[PDB]
């Protein structure tokens, strides 16, 4: 039976409200409703791994696992495995694999942040789990973000601080967080940015939904402004939203948003918003396509919609040779040439690399760079011809195509990264000098750019 090079995920995101689910929540696995939903052709086919994430969650694990599980075996008529369940406080995550995946599916980690200090920790956070499918990493984040209209810049900090804490991955990638570690990074929650517009507008806003004009909305999201401004999620994708906001409705209807001020919300206005989202990030040149991006219009207990998106995913199989794993193959190598990193820093310490890849038995540290100023006031640490030949444990090219390297620059002085980034080796051609570049971020915020030169010698 061949190993499969490609799988697909369904994301769920659902702020229940701290209200039990109704009896029927089937439309939401099999994304109906409204937005980019899924073709009622496909409705028996089983995606190959399902994470839920919620937020105000009144249920056990025990009583969300059996609604999850029984809901997946009456659509699909398999009986799911449960991969890994974190709950903190009433954020969960639950992520469930057909059973033909559990052989496939290893190192499972899982992992929570508790956001804010004093007042503002107790209830707002992260959960997330990671884990290796065959030869491919990847991470799960389900987050509840900070509420109310006025707080856009907390739940920024907020990301921050989930991205910097949330230990999930391979350990020994010490410089990288969570934006680095996984082939496919899902991120999803109640996170909680909303339509920036006048409370005077609320009737105006409910009369676009109506007519099912997002534009005007969508261009006042804050998440999007936000991340066009490159204030928060920084390299990661979004489908468009099609949808009607998923927040805040009255319960048991979808007819009617309640937005007004009251005791129950601290006198708070809210503005029908998009405050449940997904997001990803893959490694560079890897397939990761959105097939749906949606919100149910039938599960109605809470004051927030269900939201779905699927996705198909590259993958590949754990590889052996005759060589490695347990030694390296001599007919591969990996060579950056004519490299220079050009950092935002105004510290004047000498830089060396770390290269990180599970095609290399080990990260391997180069020499220090050499400093020089940029006309415009940067950094640029030139390396010449001077980087480590890397050494990778197998040298057929259908393994090391489909490879990536993880760059870290670090200060001599501290031995701490200043910043972050992945080359991937998907090149147009082999035994020839291809231009490289990536971004380097440093906590998910720009810091630099790396540039150069990469020869991959593979077996062909
Ligand atoms: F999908 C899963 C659901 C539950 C547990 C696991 C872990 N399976 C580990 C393993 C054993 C042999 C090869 O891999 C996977």
Redesign the pocket.
């Given at each position: 039976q061949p190993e499969p090079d490609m799988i697909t995920i369904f994301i769920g995101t659902w702020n229940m409200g701290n209200a039990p689910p109704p009896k029927k929540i089937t439309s939401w696995f099999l994304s109906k409703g409204q937005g980019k939903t899924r073709d009622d052709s496909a409705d028996y086919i089983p995606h190959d791994i399902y994470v839920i994430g919620t937020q105000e969650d009144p249920l056990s694990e025990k009583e969300w696992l059996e609604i999850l599980k029984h809901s997946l075996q009456e659509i699909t008529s398999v009986t799911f495995?449960?991969?890994a369940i974190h709950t903190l406080w009433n954020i969960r995550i639950v992520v469930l694999?057909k059973p033909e995946?559990?052989?496939?599916?290893?190192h499972?980690c899982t992992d929570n942040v508790k956001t804010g200090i004093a007042n503002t920790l107790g209830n707002k956070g992260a959960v997330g789990v990671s884990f290796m499918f065959n030869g491919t990493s990847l991470g799960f984040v389900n987050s509840h973000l900070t509420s109310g209209s006025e707080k856009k810049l907390r739940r920024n900090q907020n990301y921050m601080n989930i991205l910097r804490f949330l230990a999930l991955g391979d350990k020994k990638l010490s410089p990288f967080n969570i934006t680095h570690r996984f082939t496919h990074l899902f991120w999803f929650g109640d996170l909680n940015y909303r339509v920036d517009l006048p409370t005077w507008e609320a009737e105006t806003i409910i009369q676009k939904i109506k007519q099912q004009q997002y534009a005007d909305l969508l261009s006042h999201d804050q998440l999007l402004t936000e991340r066009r401004e490159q204030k928060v999620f920084l390299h990661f994708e979004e489908e468009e939203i099609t949808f009607a906001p998923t927040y805040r409705f009255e319960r048991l209807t979808r007819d009617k948003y309640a937005y007004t001020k009251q005791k129950a919300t601290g006198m708070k206005y809210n503005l029908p918003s998009w405050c449940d989202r997904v997001l990803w990030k893959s490694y560079p040149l890897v397939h990761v396509v959105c097939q749906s991006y949606g919100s149910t219009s039938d599960i109605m207990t809470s004051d927030h919609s269900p939201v779905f998106a699927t996705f198909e995913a590259g993958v590949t199989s754990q590889f052996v040779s005759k060589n490695g794993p347990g030694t390296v193959d001599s007919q591969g190598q990996i060579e950056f040439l004519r490299c220079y990193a050009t950092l935002k820093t105004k510290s004047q310490t000498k830089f060396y690399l770390e290269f990180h890849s599970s095609c290399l038995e080990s990260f391997v540290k180069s020499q220090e760079g050499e400093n020089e100023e940029g006309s415009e006031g940067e950094l640029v640490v030139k390396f010449g011809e001077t980087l480590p030949k890397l050494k990778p444990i197998i040298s057929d090219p259908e393994y090391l195509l489909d490879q990536h390297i993880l760059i870290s620059i670090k200060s001599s002085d501290s031995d701490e990264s200043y910043g972050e980034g992945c080359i991937a080796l998907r090149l147009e051609a082999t035994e020839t000098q291809l231009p490289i570049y990536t971004p380097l971020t440093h906590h998910g915020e720009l810091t630099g750019h790396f540039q150069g030169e990469i020869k991959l010698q593979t077996s062909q």
């Open positions: 495995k449960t991969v694999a995946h559990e052989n496939r599916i290893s499972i």
